[PDB]
Design a protein around this ligand. Structure first.
Ligand SMILES: Nc1ncnc2c1ncn2[C@@H]1O[C@H](CSCC[C@H](N)C(=O)O)[C@@H](O)[C@H]1O
Ligand SMILES: Nc1ncnc2c1ncn2[C@@H]1O[C@H](CSCC[C@H](N)C(=O)O)[C@@H](O)[C@H]1O
Lengths: 229, 229
């Protein structure tokens, strides 16, 4: 079934607005077909109650069962120099089930902060689009950028993806942790220097196989491993 | 270092051409600088013999060992209706170590075989840039298209990624099979019918956690898990 996101409910009715009425519109959707609507926590199976052109109402036919992410991952991403690449990594972090997304400024990452801050609004909307197709009940929190030199390992287990270092495989890390910190570098990668600071602070360094991946194919690569295990 | 591609080796000199030359100069390589060139199954570390107006000769200094994929994966990707998507799926398939890529014609996927055969050339070239960037010397073979109906569990472990069926957990698959066969669906997934046919054969259905992912994200997820063992 199709899925939409509503930010307002009255009694047992969810209301779509703006972008949603368009999305829902292009979707013909016979007068009474069941489509989902995630609202403040869960997703609700609904049938149209009345359709406009500016706003639409849906009636809750059933509390749909919504699963949560087995692990609480906080992906610390080094902002790619090509910000569009960050559009993917954000949508994807979302479908994969990442609870938190933190942009990082590293020696080789995009450097401007304001541009990163202004990119948030779009980071956010993309999350929404993603929790609709992904049917993800809750959102992915996008945070204010933090400097790579300020990271501290704080999760049950803490990883740093590095292709330059001869690290351990994911299997070797504590895959039985409930919360994780995962630091991925930009297109240019991590400087031998800055990653040494990290392994020293405690971030366990993982080496994926069998080649060098673009930063985004590396992100899903490991998140996939850390969420499915 | 910088890795380039070559299909011309006159002597101990690996010649570069067309776009591979525009990249070389756009990289202002300083004389005696060290870079690599992939040729006939392996990468050689080379120092620039001389960048000609057209060609660009590269002197071989040492034949580097090639690191082959720990697993033998054959990807069966249902061509996505949005063909630009196959651009990234062929790419990521490549840097992940997938050996064979087979485009599939399924009920809810792209259909025009004629187009699939043509956009294939574009893909073969997306592979070379992916080999160069992922220091990958072994070529991913893109085969002629085939439809689901004709698929065969030719490999040891044969999987079918489906979000519609409560298949097995990724962690419970033969994570130590030598060869593999992964079948992924187009945007609309696999219909109960087609999947049930594939499962009807030896194809083991797998379910990823915890949400529904777009095809490209799933391709990465299943293979990132299998390759990193
Ligand atoms: N094989 C691998 N194992 C672990 N991490 C990888 C990886 N391949 C890529 N990554 C991740 O992707 C990020 C950017 S890849 C940077 C590659 C570098 N420019 C080079 O020339 O080799 C890396 O910092 C790391 O976080
Ligand atoms: N969680 C998951 N488990 C297994 N396979 C998945 C998956 N999420 C996506 N896929 C793969 O990605 C393909 C396209 S996603 C299909 C989603 C489906 N049309 C829907 O809206 O419900 C699926 O057919 C499957 O091959």
């Amino acid at each position: 079934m199709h899925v939409f996101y509503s930010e307002e409910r009255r009694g047992n009715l969810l209301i779509l607005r703006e972008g949603e009425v368009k999305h829902f519109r292009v979707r013909r959707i016979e007068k009474d077909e069941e489509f989902g609507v995630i609202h403040e926590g869960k997703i609700y199976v609904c049938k149209v109650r009345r359709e406009d052109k500016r706003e639409i109402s849906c009636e809750i036919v059933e509390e749909l069962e919504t699963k949560l992410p087995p692990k609480d991952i906080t992906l610390y991403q080094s902002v790619t120099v090509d910000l569009k690449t960050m559009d993917t990594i954000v949508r994807q972090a979302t479908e994969l089930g990442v609870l938190t997304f933190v942009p990082i400024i590293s020696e080789r990452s995009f450097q401007k902060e304001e541009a990163i801050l202004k990119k948030t609004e779009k980071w956010k909307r993309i999350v929404i689009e993603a929790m609709k197709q992904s049917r993800r009940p809750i959102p992915m929190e996008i945070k204010k950028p933090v400097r790579l030199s300020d990271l501290i390992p704080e999760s049950e287990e803490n990883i740093i993806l590095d292709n330059f270092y001869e690290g351990v495989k994911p299997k070797d890390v504590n895959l039985e942790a409930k919360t994780y910190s995962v630091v991925v570098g930009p297109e240019g990668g991590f400087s031998k220097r800055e990653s040494q600071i990290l392994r020293e602070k405690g971030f366990k360094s993982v080496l994926l196989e069998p080649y060098t991946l673009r930063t985004e194919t590396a992100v899903v690569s490991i998140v996939s491993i850390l969420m499915n295990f």
